[PDB]
Amino acid sequence: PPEYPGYRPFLDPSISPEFVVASEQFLSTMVPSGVYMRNASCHFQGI
């Protein structure tokens, strides 16, 4: 993202309904079927 320009008191920060689809409903294409568990030193069998 572009660097911080400063506080803009006139920018409207509201959330749009299209943002609910672009961000949250899109993340489901990446959710896996199982999730691992790991040691502190490379051991995966459920800690």
Q: Smallest gap, in angstroms, from Cβ of residue 11 to a second copy?
A: 6
Cα(8)–Cα(2) distance, integer angstroms: 14
23 touches ligand NAG by CB under 6 A = no
Please name the residues in contact with 37: beta carbons below 8 A apart, sequence gap of 6 or more.
44, 46, 47
**Per-residue x/- mask for a second copy, residues 1 to 40, rule CB under 8 A?**
--------xxxx----------------------------
Q: Which amino acid is at 39?
A: N
For a second copy, give the closer residue by CB, 22 or 38: 22
